[PDB]
């Protein structure tokens, strides 16, 4: 309960770091676009990805991850930009593999916005089939009646 506050703060700091990385990468992309300089490339998310995968993979962190809406930040990494473009394949595959192991429920999808993003992955022509089908399996599962 102070052990539980320490876990919360640790997940909340990752949540912030993920959002800062995503915003930095968007700034870089916009600059690469404005200037046409292809030596500018967004790297903040990929540098942070190993930590995100590590944390998301820890069984005893599931409750803290789910209770602190870390899936919101996961959703921000996955979500399409307004032109419809997606993060790299490596980010998609790493995040979806990590989500495959988390006990996600409808309430988390609603609160994080992840539900509508995972649905988008089931439909977008830009997504590799293996990930589109995994997205379709996960959404069915996460929203299942619960016998």
UniProtKB/Swiss-Prot annotation:
Q: List each copy of the TFIIS N-terminal domain by range.
A: 72-147
TM region positions: none
Q: Which residues form a coiled coil?
A: none
Question: What subcellular locations does the record give?
Answer: Nucleus
List other remarks.
Present with 2830 molecules/cell in log phase SD medium.
- Which family does the similarity line name? Belongs to the IWS1 family.
Please give the subunit comment from the record: Interacts with ABD1, RBP1, SPT5 and SPT6.
Function, as annotated, reads:
Transcription factor involved in RNA polymerase II transcription regulation. May function in both SPT15/TBP post-recruitment and recruitment steps of transcription.
Could you identify this protein by its name?
Transcription factor SPN1
The major lineage groups are: Eukaryota, Fungi, Dikarya, Ascomycota, Saccharomycotina
**Gene name, please?**
SPN1
What range of the parent protein does this fragment cover?
Answer: 148 to 294 of 410
